[PDB]
Every structure is written in C-alpha cells, then in structure tokens.
Structure 1
Amino acid sequence: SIDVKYIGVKSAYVSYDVQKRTIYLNITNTLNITNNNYYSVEVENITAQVQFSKTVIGKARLNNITIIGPLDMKQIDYTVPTVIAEEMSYMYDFCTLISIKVHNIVLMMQVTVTTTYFGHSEQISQERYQYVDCG
C-alpha cells in the first residue's frame, strides 16, 4: 500500500552492472550514501470505540422465512462430451487439452450476511502467470 513494486528482472539501489564481452579498465568508483527511512504507518490514537448490536423481538409471528448467504450455486450443469471415431485413418492429437472449471488464485475475505468491521484489511496479489507454453 506504500512501496509495492513489480520488478521484472533486476532491482537495485546502486547497480554497477557489467555484462558479456567488456573491458572495465581503470575506473575509480566512489560512493557516499545516506538512506534514512522513517516509517510510522498505521499508528492510531483512539480514546473510545463501541461496536453495538441489539435485537429485540416480541409477540410477533414469524412464518416461512429464508435468509440466504451471499453466493448460491443451484442446478449447474457441465455436460461436455468428446466422441472420436476413426476408420482406416490417421489422427495426431498433439498438445490437446480440455479445461473445465478451474481457478488459480482465490482469496475471499469476510463476505458475510452481517458484518461490523473496524480497522484495516487489504488484499495484494503479485504473480507471473502463464497458462500454456506449448513449444
């Protein structure tokens, strides 16, 4: 949330990179670094805080009632066939893949019916994704 990077290959503060087939002959490198860093993140100052929830019921009739959670899956159908016939023939199935429901990165976080939240929360993702490398 402050100093988040995505760095492909090389990361450095001071880099004297030298690579194939070079001459580094009579150099006189000199450095003088002062890199102070003061972090005061998420410092808080609270005198009072109240999280109050009340429920009063009385002399009431509560008939057929449903409270359903956030995500519901019902009557979901995946009906993928694969019929292959061959009579005096040549078939060369190379790098053939059939992909059905699939995830890689799944993060859920208090997806509820009732929630009273105070504070800090976050979700950070960094990857190098690559599905198929079919050479």
Structure 2
Amino acid sequence: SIDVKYIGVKSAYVSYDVQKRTIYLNITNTLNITNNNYYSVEVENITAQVQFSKTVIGKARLNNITIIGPLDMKQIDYTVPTVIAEEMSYMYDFCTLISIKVHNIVLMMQVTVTTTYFGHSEQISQERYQYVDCG
C-alpha cells in the first residue's frame, strides 16, 4: 500500500468551510494549486523464475500415513440452556442479546497444506464498529 487514510468526518485537500450563524463578508480568496503525482509501484524484472516440485518413491512401504491441514475443528460442543420460570412477576427485557459464534470479517488467503508462491500479498480492512446501541 501507499496511501491508506481513515477520516472520521471530513477529508479535504482544501476546505473553505463556514459554519452556521456566521457572517462572511468582504472576502477575497485567491488559490493556485499545482499538484503532481508520479507512481511507480510493483515493477518486477525477472530474467528467469523457476519453481520445481519433485516427488520420487521407490520400492517403499508406507502405512498409517496421515496428513491434516490447518483449521481442524473436532468434537466441539456448545450448550447454552435458557430456562425462565415466572410466578406473578413483571418481566421487562428491553434489549437482551444471546450471541454464539458471531463473525463479522473473515478474510482467508493461502491457507493450504503445501504452498509455493511468489510476489505480493496484501490485506486491508477498514470498518467503523457498533455492536449494541440501546437508547
């Protein structure tokens, strides 16, 4: 990345801003902007690139061979009982939340067992989070 910007409200190169209930009288504004941008990003000069994978098996006895990749979830139990017994009561639940395994952003790249790779990998995440808002 080159230019990553997070701005809460207002982003401006030039901002002539006047707010409310304001007197803006007898103003002479002169502005000259000579802006130039030159970009040379991700230039590659490879005369020879070689990726080689070789597997050779000869008169071999293989048994009980197990290969497991990443992210192996096994024998997982969730138990969230919710028992509510009432007896001449006044129940007032305004905003009650029961969240189980809530995912917002899941970015996965090159999650493998055997990988051979060359170059650039980029991940960018921007957000403005707000889970619960009870007024």
Q: Would you call these one fold, judging by a TM-score over 0.5?
A: yes
Q: Which residue of 2 aligns with 1:83?
A: 83
- Deviating 4+ runs (over 3 angstroms): none
CA distance in structure 2 between the aligned counterparts of 1:7 and 1:94, rounded to whole angstroms: 34
Q: Following TM superposition, by how much is the alpha carbon of 1:90 offset from its aligned partner in structure 2, in angstroms? A: 1.3
Stretches of structure 1 that go unaligned for 5 or more consecutive residues are none
CA distance in structure 1 between the aligned counterparts of 2:112 and 2:52, rounded to whole angstroms: 18
Cα distance per residue 1:100-134 (max 9 Å; x no partner): 11100100001111000101111000001110011
Alignment of 1:1-135 (within 5 A): 1-135=1-135
Cα distance per residue 1:64-105 (max 9 Å; x no partner): 111001011111000000000011111111101111111001
Stretches of structure 2 that go unaligned for 5 or more consecutive residues are none
CA distance in structure 1 between the aligned counterparts of 2:44 and 2:18, rounded to whole angstroms: 47
TM-score (norm 2): 0.97
Q: Following TM superposition, by how much is the alpha carbon of 1:57 offset from its aligned partner in structure 2, in angstroms? A: 0.6
Q: Which has the higher strand share?
A: 2
Aligned length: 135
CA distance in structure 2 between the aligned counterparts of 1:4 and 1:93, rounded to whole angstroms: 43
Cα distance per residue 1:3-59 (max 9 Å; x no partner): 000011000111101110111101110011111000000011111100111111110
TM-score (norm 1): 0.97
RMSD of Structure 2 on Structure 1 (CA) = 0.7
